[PDB]
Amino acid sequence: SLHGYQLEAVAPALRGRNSIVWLPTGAGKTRAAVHVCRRHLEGRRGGRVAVLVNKVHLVQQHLEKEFHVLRDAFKVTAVSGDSSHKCFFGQLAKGSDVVICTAQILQNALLSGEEEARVELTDFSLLVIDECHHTQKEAVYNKIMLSYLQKKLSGQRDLPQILGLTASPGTGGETSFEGAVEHILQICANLDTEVIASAQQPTKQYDLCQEREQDPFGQRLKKIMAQIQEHMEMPELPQNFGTQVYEQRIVELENRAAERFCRKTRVCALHLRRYNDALLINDTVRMMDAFQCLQQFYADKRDTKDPTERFLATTFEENRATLQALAGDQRYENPRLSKLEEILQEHFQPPGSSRGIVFTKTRQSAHSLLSWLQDTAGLCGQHIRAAVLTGSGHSNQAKGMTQNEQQDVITLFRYGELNLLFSTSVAEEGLDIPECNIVVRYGLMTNEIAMVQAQGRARAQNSMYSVLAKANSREVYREQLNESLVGLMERAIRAVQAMPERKYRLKIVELQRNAVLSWQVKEARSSERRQLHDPDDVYFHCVNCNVAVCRGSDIRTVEAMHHVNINPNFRFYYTVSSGKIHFERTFRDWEPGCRIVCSECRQEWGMEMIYRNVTLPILSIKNFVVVTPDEKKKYKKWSTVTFPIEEFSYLEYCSSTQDES
RNA sequence: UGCUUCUGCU
RNA sequence: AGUAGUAACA
Numbered sequence: 268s269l270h271g272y273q274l275e276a277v278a279p280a281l282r283g284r285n286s287i288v289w290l291p292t293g294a295g296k297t298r299a300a301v302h303v304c305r306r307h308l309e310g311r312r313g314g315r316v317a318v319l320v321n322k323v324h325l326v327q328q329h330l331e332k333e334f335h336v337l338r339d340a341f342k343v344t345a346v347s348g349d350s351s352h353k354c355f356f357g358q359l360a361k362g363s364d365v366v367i368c369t370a371q372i373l374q375n376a377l378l379s380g381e382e383e384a385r386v387e388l389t390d391f392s393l394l395v396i397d398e399c400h401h402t403q404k405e406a407v408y409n410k411i412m413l414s415y416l417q418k419k420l421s422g423q424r425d426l427p428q429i430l431g432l433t434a435s436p437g438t439g440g441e442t443s444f445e446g447a448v449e450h451i452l453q454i455c456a457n458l459d460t461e462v463i464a465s466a467q468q469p470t471k472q473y474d475l476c477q478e479r480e481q482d483p484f485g486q487r488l489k490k491i492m493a494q495i496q497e498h499m500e501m502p503e504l505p506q507n508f509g510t511q512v513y514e515q516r517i518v519e520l521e522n523r524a525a526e527r528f529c530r531k532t533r534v535c536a537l538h539l540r541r542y543n544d545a546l547l548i549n550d551t552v553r554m555m556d557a558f559q560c561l562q563q564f565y566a567d568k569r570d571t572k573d574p575t576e577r578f579l580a581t582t583f584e585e586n587r588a589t590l591q592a593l594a595g596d597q598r599y600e601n602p603r604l605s606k607l608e609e610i611l612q613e614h615f616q617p618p619g620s621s622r623g624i625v626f627t628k629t630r631q632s633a634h635s636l637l638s639w640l641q642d643t644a645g646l647c648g649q650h651i652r653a654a655v656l657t658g659s660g661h662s663n664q665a666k667g668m669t670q671n672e673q674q675d676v677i678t679l680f681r682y683g684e685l686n687l688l689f690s691t692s693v694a695e696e697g698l699d700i701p702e703c704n705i706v707v708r709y710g711l712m713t714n715e716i717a718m719v720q721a722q723g724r725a726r727a728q729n730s731m732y733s734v735l736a737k738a739n740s741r742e743v744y745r746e747q748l749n750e751s752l753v754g755l756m757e758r759a760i761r762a763v764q765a766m767p768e769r770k771y772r773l774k775i776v777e778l779q780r781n782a783v784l785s786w787q788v789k790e791a792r793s794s795e796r797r798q799l800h801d802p803d804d805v806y807f808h809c810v811n812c813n814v815a816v817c818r819g820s821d822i823r824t825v826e827a828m829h830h831v832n833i834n835p836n837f838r839f840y841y842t843v844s845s846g847k848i849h850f851e852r853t854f855r856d857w858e859p860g861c862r863i864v865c866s867e868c869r870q871e872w873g874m875e876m877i878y879r880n881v882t883l884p885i886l887s888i889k890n891f892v893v894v895t896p897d898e899k900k901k902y903k904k905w906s907t908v909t910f911p912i913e914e915f916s917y918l919e920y921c922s923s924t925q926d927e928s
Numbered sequence: 929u930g931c932u933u934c935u936g937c938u
Numbered sequence: 939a940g941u942a943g944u945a946a947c948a
């Protein structure tokens with residue numbers, strides 16, 4: 268049965284008041300919400316609840332661990348990206364008493380032009396927003412709630428009650444009391460909160476490592492980078508190799524070289540980014556991980572004419588064997604990994620006692636840590652059974668994990684079939700593993716919310732939380748600051764809870780008005796930008812070889828995301844460059860075909876979309892330079908281009924191609 | 929693998 | 939204004 272503090276925290280929600288339930292990590296906010304939902308549905312006819320989450324895995328978790336109990340009396344349905352294609356959301360939701368989904372599923376339905384796929388906010392009488400601290404800025408939670416505010420302020424009746432759940436509203440980067448209070452008020456405004464409802468041990472250790480005394484591998488990479496920069500014959504080139512600033516500056520240089528079609532500079536900049544990437548890997552995991560980064564990059568090359576590429580290939584080849592030999596030398600081991608080994612050795616003896624998550628920033632790092640573990644003699648024999656856990660992010664450096672793949676790892680971790688995960692931020696919030704008693708945060712730079720949340724995955728009574736970071740580093744400073752900011756957040760929330768009602772209400776009104784006005788202004792500005800140029804006056808150039816390949820007027824959008832070229836002669840500019848792509852996820856109206864490349868230079872451009880009975884090429888914006896009358900620009904997003912793009916019409920497209928045959 | 933939110937960084 | 943990552947959607 269519910270704890271006293273659970274009953275106390277939901278008392279406002281039971282009375283119908285919009286609220287945020289502020290309870291610590293692991294305190295049982297979900298069960299409290301289920302109780303609210305049961306009483307809500309019992310207390311009226313025709314009620315309907317939406318439960319919004321921010322991570323695919325939490326749909327299944329909340330259903331199977333908490334919300335399924337409602338099925339004694341009510342119909343409960345769950346939807347995530349994997350199951351999206353199976354039903355029209357409108358039909359599914361309307362046939363349910365409770366629907367649990369990732370928030371973007373609901374947002375898509377709110378925006379839909381299809382009768383059967385569409386819902387309105389007024390189709391729900393209660394919205395439960397899990398991890399509601401994400402309801403800010405342009406996060407999907409806030410896109411939904413901004414619409415709610417627009418409707419509320421316009422006088423709409425029968426908007427749903429709001430129940431937000433969070434352990435950590437945060438301070439939003441504010442370090443003053445006044446700033447932190449303002450942030451809390453902003454959260455409250457965004458969620459249309461009437462009351463923040465709250466209640467009326469673990470140990471933490473800093474496992475600090477030192478910089479490697481001797482890093483010949485890194486030293487050699489830096490010496491190659493200097494040689495490459497000399498070859499570029501340019502003044503004021505950055506010298507700060509192996510930093511995030513260098514990474515930014517070298518990519519910005521690549522962008523400028525694309526925009527001005529300086530091939531030599533661009534190619535050199537491309538390679539330097541890879542060397543910098545290797546330095547960053549070298550600092551995070553093993554030398555051999557960094558080596559493999561570079562080796563793979565240069566292996567996938569073939570013999571070419573381009574004198575620049577030949578210089579760069581020769582340069583790597585001259586250093587390759589030395590780099591690999593160094594990478595196999597235990598003398599130059601990463602102290603971060605030495606420290607991690609110490610932690611695991613201490614806590615996973617005797618074998619199978621501990622149940623741990625090691626959080627790392629990137630998917631690639633998680634995979635490298637698993638590989639490192641499997642290859643560390645000092646850990647083999649301690650019956651550590653480990654696996655990687657990531658979300659469904661994807662890049663050429665690392666694929667993601669499907670909902671199903673994630674679920675397999677989580678289920679085996681829950682009762683100790685696996686006893687250690689190497690995880691990204693996919694599992695920093697929400698994941699409930701009662702037996703988890705160790706969290707290590709490996710060299711992370713995050714806000715205080717992520718710190719609190721990740722720590723909170725260790726549910727067990729006698730849990731430990733380890734910060735594994737470089738001594739004297741910004742990472743250590745930020746951890747310490749974040750600890751203080753948690754305290755500041757608490758003080759700010761208390762102050763808001765104690766505010767006089769009249770003052771609170773007026774402040775919320777002022778903030779909600781500001782939010783809905785600011786949105787209108789932003790939308791007007793965005794529209795003005797996208798109407799600057801006639802699409803006929805915009806030309807796309809291949810980013811690699813600078814050949815012109817189409818005009819803006821050749822492009823249409825599918826599902827407001829996928830930019831297809833509908834010109835029947837575009838086929839003479841691109842080549843199909845792969846066998847058929849397969850995705851685990853199925854979509855309603857299309858599936859990928861093959862990858863496509865520039866016919867001149869083989870630069871990757873995008874992929875085919877098999878949309879119903881036609882095949883069209885999708886272009887990724889990052890593979891082009893966009894040329895207008897005013898400038899040449901390499902865009903990383905379509906959303907900021909300076910010309911309008913019409914929606915694809917399948918009917919019109921079919922009619923048009925039939926006339927040509 | 930198309931998309932662009934968030935977080936870090938400048 | 940970018941950049942890097944990440945996650946979500948498709």
Ligand SMILES: Nc1ncnc2c1ncn2[C@@H]1O[C@H](COP(=O)(O)OP(=O)(O)O)[C@@H](O)[C@H]1O
Pocket residue numbers: 268269270273290291292293294295296297298299332434697698699701
């Ligand atoms: N009243 C209760 N009695 C026993 N276990 C409970 C109670 N309420 C919640 N739990 C359990 O507490 C754990 C943490 O709950 P959860 O909802 O994941 O925490 P959070 O507040 O971070 O969402 C879960 O395993 C849940 O089933």
Ligand code: ALF
Pocket residue numbers: 290291292293294296398433434696697698699723724
């Ligand atoms: F605060 Al939680 F799962 F919602 F730790």
Ligand SMILES: [Mg+2]
Pocket residue numbers: 296297697
């Ligand atoms: Mg939770």
Ligand SMILES: [Zn+2]
Pocket residue numbers: 809810811812813814865866867868869870
């Ligand atoms: Zn080309």
